[PDB]
Amino acid sequence: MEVQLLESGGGLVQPGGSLRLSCAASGFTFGNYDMAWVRQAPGKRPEWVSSIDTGGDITHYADSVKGRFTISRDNAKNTLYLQMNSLRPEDTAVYWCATDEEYALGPNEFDYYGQGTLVTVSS
Amino acid sequence: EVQLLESGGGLVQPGGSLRLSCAASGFTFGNYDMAWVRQAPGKRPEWVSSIDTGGDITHYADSVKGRFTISRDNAKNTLYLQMNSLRPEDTAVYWCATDEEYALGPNEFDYYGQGTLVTVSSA
Amino acid sequence: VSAYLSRPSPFDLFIRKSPTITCLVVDLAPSKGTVNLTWSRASGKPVNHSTRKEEKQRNGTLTVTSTLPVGTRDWIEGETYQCRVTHPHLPRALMRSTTKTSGPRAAPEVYAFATPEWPGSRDKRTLACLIQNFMPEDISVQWLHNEVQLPDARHSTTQPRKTKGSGFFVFSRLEVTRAEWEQKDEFICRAVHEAASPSQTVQRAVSVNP
Amino acid sequence: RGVSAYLSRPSPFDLFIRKSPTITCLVVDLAPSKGTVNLTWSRASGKPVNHSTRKEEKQRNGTLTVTSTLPVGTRDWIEGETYQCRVTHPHLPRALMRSTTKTSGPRAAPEVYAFATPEWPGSRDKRTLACLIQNFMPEDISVQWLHNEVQLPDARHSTTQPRKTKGSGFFVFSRLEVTRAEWEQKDEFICRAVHEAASPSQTVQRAVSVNP
Ligand SMILES: *[C@@H]1O[C@H](CO)[C@@H](O[C@@H]2O[C@H](CO)[C@@H](O[C@@H]3O[C@H](CO[C@H]4O[C@H](CO[C@H]5O[C@H](CO)[C@@H](O)[C@H](O)[C@@H]5O)[C@@H](O)[C@H](O[C@H]5O[C@H](CO)[C@@H](O)[C@H](O)[C@@H]5O)[C@@H]4O)[C@@H](O)[C@H](O[C@H]4O[C@H](CO)[C@@H](O)[C@H](O)[C@@H]4O)[C@@H]3O)[C@H](O)[C@H]2NC(C)=O)[C@H](O)[C@H]1NC(C)=O
Ligand SMILES: *[C@@H]1O[C@H](CO)[C@@H](O[C@@H]2O[C@H](CO)[C@@H](O[C@@H]3O[C@H](CO[C@H]4O[C@H](CO[C@H]5O[C@H](CO)[C@@H](O)[C@H](O)[C@@H]5O)[C@@H](O)[C@H](O[C@H]5O[C@H](CO)[C@@H](O)[C@H](O)[C@@H]5O)[C@@H]4O)[C@@H](O)[C@H](O[C@H]4O[C@H](CO)[C@@H](O)[C@H](O)[C@@H]4O)[C@@H]3O)[C@H](O)[C@H]2NC(C)=O)[C@H](O)[C@H]1NC(C)=O
């Protein structure tokens, strides 16, 4: 087992737009790990975004993104998703999917990070 | 695995002499530097002396310099400490010690023996 | 495959006064058979009933954890406990043993500090406690607020490490919120260790605002 | 199988200050000397590999350690090259392989706080200096102590392993013992941290003094 996580779906969108991020998992049994998303906006300290349960019953969100983004996963396709709605200039950042051997539901210094993808929100 | 067994403690009058023997077993004694440490009642431990692998290098604490003599015999797997001109101040429990990395100076040694008691008094 | 055997914590030994030793077996590529682990003494005296726990890890590793309550006097007087591990696809049984560490004894000294305030965190502050000058390595560090011990997860404590002639040392880091210090501005760093006197504990209190 | 192998990343001091990063492959061999260990450096990209040095020494308990160090390109490492250390020995059934590349993920600059312990009974010629480096990530960091504008030997101080804070970044503690002669000479001791995300030149530092 070696953890490989590859993000996709970044790009440029106008404020008020929406975007869907797909993180593909490979090299481990995806259905055993909690998953999370982390972002870092240019020149700002990293911020934990959201996290998902193993089965999907538990969702957690930071207050800054709560009710705008919705996290989900498909365990048969080995793919984690983040659906972003009502984007603001505040949300321009690089986004990573992450996981940890012990704790992944909350903010943490996760053991594994993907490669990241960029979301630029502007006119 | 390092097993160290002290012997030779007892009761002696001021100015007397006593000889401490630490028997080594379970490892290649000829590869390790050796040292002696003591703890007097209600006082913090004090490093006493240390011996080189071959026997060429000797170190002593200032309190015991020229009064004690350390030695080792590698064919008999035995470390010795010869104490001359003993004082009441030298009443302590004595341990022989060794370490995988550093043993010449005072240190938090990896291995200690079982200890033996030396009482210097008028008796 | 690897096996480990712990010593009692000083908190278990001296505060609760019911020490326990844990034998831990970590099994990669598992489930060919069933792991059998047997507690024994070197002296041959009876061993108490042991708990046994099996948990599957996220990476597919199986861990087998067994914990034995041991006699308070027996451990202090140098008893030796052995955990012997049998499994059918293991070629020869793994044996681990444990006993009180011999050698000199030294009381910890405890110093507790409060980091300066930093932009971005004016609703929490970082508390830092230094425990040093002690030996043997075994120590338990605890944080108390309003006379009640905080959960262990609130703080993180470094592994003990040598100073080359002064004894072992450890640091403790705790994050406290504004509500907690507004409630009561006293946070207590307490160390449990064999050579501490009078009751095997030493502590120092720190406050955010002097 | 009685043998174990490990592979490092460049230290931040080598990478950003010395500016000659190096990666070290370590093979620790219990019950050794049946044959000779051959380890071959390779890349994932397939580009040439620099010449590597080798040191093999016997431990006190009779274990053999085989250490090889490879200089890596400063440009190559930062831009994500992947290096593999491949270990061959005649009593191994299959070769051991370890690989390394810069850790991915978000990055945060350290904060440094330096303290001076109170006087302690028993010595008027020594004091303990304590430095806290925290709130950074990734884990890779190098911590250094400077006095009289010159870096102290590594052995003078001891620095805790990086460990998580559950959402605030990694942290390490450093402990230094200073003698009376040194602070009488100049009462300023500087704790300096080298880290990738430190700015402006990959360094952050704080000075501490024995007597306020
Ligand atoms: C798949 O994932 C799993 C993850 O679970 C992984 O399995 C882990 O593998 C490693 C080894 O391969 C294991 O690590 C070992 O952990 C041992 C357990 O130590 C725990 O308990 C210690 C004792 O606690 C008792 O005693 C103390 C007082 O003594 C008392 O306070 C307690 O209440 C209790 O009664 C304890 O010391 C230790 O806690 C410290 O360390 C952890 C480590 O991160 C840290 O989280 C804490 O903050 C604390 O500082 C821990 O809680 C341990 O005994 C053992 O350590 C020895 O060996 C190493 C290696 O030589 C030495 O360096 C060290 O000096 C010791 O001699 C070792 O660290 C780990 O425990 C496995 N799993 C679990 C569930 O624990 C698999 O490897 C993964 N898959 C693959 C392919 O790797
Ligand atoms: C017989 O005796 C021998 C010798 O005593 C003993 O052999 C030891 O065997 C163990 C395993 O069985 C080895 O343990 C491993 O050690 C690895 C070496 O780490 C060294 O180098 C690390 C990398 O340094 C490079 O990079 C850094 C920055 O990254 C840079 O600063 C450097 O300049 C360099 O370029 C370094 O991190 C490490 O330093 C830490 O550890 C020392 C330990 O004393 C400590 O003093 C430091 O302050 C610092 O905390 C060290 O210098 C290491 O990579 C490896 O780590 C992995 O495993 C552990 C445990 O599973 C994990 O917790 C960890 O996350 C890693 O996955 C592991 O620690 C050990 O090195 C041997 N000792 C020697 C000298 O070779 C035998 O076991 C004995 N026989 C028996 C039967 O027991």
Give me ligand 1 centre to Cα A110, in Å.
18
Nearest-neighbour CA in chain D from C74: distance (Å): 32
Contact at 8 Å (CB) between B67 and B85?
A: yes
Of D109, D72, D134, D76, nearest to D196 (Cα)?
D109
Same domain, D11 and D39: yes
Q: Which of D67, D102, D137 is the last residue of a domain?
A: D102
Same domain, C113 and C195: yes
Structure token digits, residue C149? 């011990």
Same domain, D114 and D56: no
Strand partners, C94: C85
**Which ligand neighbours the alpha carbon of D6 most closely?**
2
Amino acid D80 reads: G
Q: Which of C32, C67, C100 is the last residue of a domain?
A: C100
Measured CA to CA in angstroms, residue C129 lies from C125, C143, C170, D68, D193 at distances of: 13, 10, 8, 39, 21
Structure token digits, residue C87? 């499994």
Domain count for chain D: 2
- How far apart are the C-alpha atoms of B53 and B72, rounded to whole Å? 9
The H or E element containing residue D24 is: strand D22-29
Contact at 8 Å (CB) between B49 and B90?
A: no
Contact at 8 Å (CB) between A104 and A30?
A: no
Where do runs of H (alpha helix) occur along D58-205?
74-78, 180-185
Strand partners, B73: B78
Contact at 8 Å (CB) between B21 and B8?
A: yes
Q: Give the three-class secondary structure for B51.
A: strand
Amino acid C142 reads: Q
Q: Is A95 exposed, middle or buried (0-12, 13-18, 19+ CB in 10 A)?
A: buried
Q: To test the ligand 2 pocket, which listed residue (D3, D8, D55) has its Cβ within 8 A of the most ligand atoms?
A: D8
β-pair type (A11-13, A117-121) = parallel
The H or E element containing residue D142 is: strand D142-147
Of B42, B39, B46, nearest to B64 (Cα)?
B46
Measured CA to CA in angstroms, residue C186 lies from C11, C145, C148, C182 at distances of: 22, 6, 11, 10
Rounded to the nearest angstrom, the gap between the alpha carbon of residue A44 and the centroid of all alpha carbons in its chain is 17
Of A122, A118, A24, nearest to A75 (Cα)?
A24
Reported for D21-25, long-range contacts at CB under 8 A and 24+ positions apart, including other chains, are D21/D71, D21/D72, D21/D74, D21/D77, D22/D69, D22/D70, D22/D71, D22/D72, D23/D69, D23/D70, D23/D72, D23/D83, D23/D100, D24/D67, D24/D68, D24/D69, D24/D70, D25/D67, D25/D68, D25/D69, D25/D70, D25/D85, D25/D87, D25/D98
Q: Which residue of D has its CA nearest to A41?
A: D106
Contact at 8 Å (CB) between C143 and C189?
A: yes
CATH of the domain at C171: 2.60.40.10
Structure token digits, residue C160? 């003990």
Same domain, C91 and C106: no
Same domain, D182 and D194: yes
Give me ligand 2 centre to Cα C168, in Å.
19
**DSSP classification of residue D108:** B
Q: How far apart are the first and last CA of chain C?
A: 53
Measured CA to CA in angstroms, residue C83 lies from C78, C91, C188, D2 at distances of: 16, 17, 37, 21
- How far apart are the C-alpha atoms of A24 and A53, rounded to whole Å? 17
Ligand 1 in reach of A101 Cβ (< 6 A): yes
Residue pointed to by tokens 């409630």? C183
Interface mutation vs chain A, best among C26, C57, C58, C63, most A CBs within 10 Å: C58
| Chain D environment of B44 (Cβ under 8 Å) | 122
Same domain, D117 and D147: yes
Reported for A7-12, long-range contacts at CB under 8 A and 24+ positions apart, including other chains, are A7/A95, A7/A96, A7/A97, A7/A114, A7/A115, A7/A116, A7/A117, A8/A117, A9/A117, A10/A95, A10/A117, A10/A118, A10/A119, A10/A120, A11/A118, A11/A119, A11/A120, A12/A120, A12/A122
Q: Give the three-class secondary structure for B86.
A: coil
- How far apart are the C-alpha atoms of A96 and A84, rounded to whole Å? 14
Same domain, C76 and C119: no
Residue pointed to by tokens 């009642």? B41
Measured CA to CA in angstroms, residue A54 lies from A47, A72, A75, A83, A99 at distances of: 22, 10, 9, 18, 11
Contact at 8 Å (CB) between C11 and C18?
A: no
- How far apart are the C-alpha atoms of D38 and B122, rounded to whole Å? 67
Interface of C with D (CB under 8 A): 109, 111, 113, 115-116, 118, 126, 128, 130, 132-133, 153, 156, 158-159, 161-163, 166, 169, 171, 173, 175
Spatial strand order of the sheet with D96-100 comes to D38-43, D83-88, D96-100
Q: How far apart are the first and last CA of chain D?
A: 57
- How far apart are the C-alpha atoms of A22 and A25, rounded to whole Å? 10
Structure token digits, residue D30? 């219990």
Report whether the peptide linkage leading into residue C136 is cis, meaning its omega lies within 30 degrees of zero. yes
- Its domain, for residue C40, covers 1-100
Counting CB pairs under 8 A, whether chains B and A reach 3 or more, is no
Instruction: Report CB contact under 8 Å: A98, D164.
Output: no
* Contacts for C19 with CB less than 8 Å, ≥ 6 apart: C8, C9, C12, C13, C69, C70, C72, C75
Neighbours of C99 (CB within 10 A): 13
Rounded to the nearest angstrom, the gap between the alpha carbon of residue C175 and the centroid of all alpha carbons in its chain is 20
Amino acid B47 reads: W
Of D47, D53, D107, nearest to D77 (Cα)?
D47
Phi, psi of A9 (to 5 degrees): 110, 0
Task: Return the HEC string of chain C.
Answer: CEEEECCCCHHHHHHHCCCEEEEEEEECCCCCCCCEEEEEECCCCCCCCCEEEEEECCCCCEEEEEEEECCHHHHHCCCCEEEEEECCCCCCCEEEEECCCCCCCECCEEEEEECCCECCECCEEEEEEEEEEEECCCCEEEEEECCEECCHHHEEECCCECCCCCCEEEEEEEEEEHHHHHHCCCEEEEEECCCCCCCCEEEEEECCCC
Same domain, C75 and C161: no
- How far apart are the C-alpha atoms of D163 and D172, rounded to whole Å? 7
Instruction: Report CB contact under 8 Å: B112, C102.
Output: yes
Question: Which subunits have 3 or more CB–CB pairs within 8 Å of chain D?
Answer: A, B, C
Same domain, C181 and C158: yes
Question: How was this one solved?
Answer: X-ray
Structure token digits, residue B123? 């008796």
The H or E element containing residue D12 is: helix D12-12
Structure token digits, residue C129? 């406690």
Amino acid C177 reads: T
Contact at 8 Å (CB) between D91 and D38?
A: no
Q: Which of C100, C117, C149 is the last residue of a domain?
A: C100
Task: Return the HEC string of C128-184.
Answer: EEEEEEEECCCCEEEEEECCEECCHHHEEECCCECCCCCCEEEEEEEEEEHHHHHHC
Q: Give the three-class secondary structure for D16.
A: helix
Residues in chain B: 123
Q: Name every protein residue with a CB atom under 6 angstroms from any ligand 2 atom.
A: B 100; D 4, 6, 8-9, 11, 24, 26, 28, 30, 59, 61, 63, 65, 161
Same domain, C136 and C200: yes
> How many angstroms separate the most distant Cα atoms in chain B?
41
Rounded to the nearest angstrom, the gap between the alpha carbon of residue B90 and the centroid of all alpha carbons in its chain is 12
Measured CA to CA in angstroms, residue D50 lies from D43, D47, D73, D85 at distances of: 11, 10, 9, 13
Rounded to the nearest angstrom, the gap between the alpha carbon of residue B71 and the centroid of all alpha carbons in its chain is 10
Residue pointed to by tokens 């008691």? B117
Of C119, C166, C193, C121, nearest to D117 (Cα)?
C166
Nearest 5°: the CA angle A106, A110, A113 is 120
- How far apart are the C-alpha atoms of B82 and B76, rounded to whole Å? 17
Contact at 8 Å (CB) between A6 and A115?
A: yes
**DSSP classification of residue B62:** T
- How far apart are the C-alpha atoms of D14 and B5, rounded to whole Å? 46
Q: How far apart are the first and last CA of chain A?
A: 43
Report whether the peptide linkage leading into residue C198 is cis, meaning its omega lies within 30 degrees of zero. yes
Contact at 8 Å (CB) between B120 and B68?
A: no
Ligand 1 in reach of C26 Cβ (< 6 A): yes
Of C118, C123, D168, nearest to A106 (Cα)?
D168
Report whether the peptide linkage leading into residue D200 is cis, meaning its omega lies within 30 degrees of zero. yes
Q: Give the three-class secondary structure for D30.
A: coil
Of D94, D77, D64, D68, nearest to D19 (Cα)?
D77
Contact at 8 Å (CB) between B85 and B15?
A: yes
Same domain, C86 and C178: no
- How far apart are the C-alpha atoms of C7 and B111, rounded to whole Å? 16
Same domain, C21 and C117: no
Structure token digits, residue B36? 């002696």
Computed on alpha carbons and rounded to an integer, the radius of gyration of chain A in Å comes to 13
- How far apart are the C-alpha atoms of D181 and B37, rounded to whole Å? 28
Residue pointed to by tokens 């390490």? D172
Side-chain-side CA neighbours of C81 within 13 Å: the count stands at 31
Instruction: Report CB contact under 8 Å: C156, D175.
Output: no
D106: left (phi over 0), alpha (psi -120 to 50) or beta: beta
Q: CA torsion sign, D182 to C132 to C78 to B120?
A: positive
- How far apart are the C-alpha atoms of C76 and C19, rounded to whole Å? 10
Strand partners, A97: A37
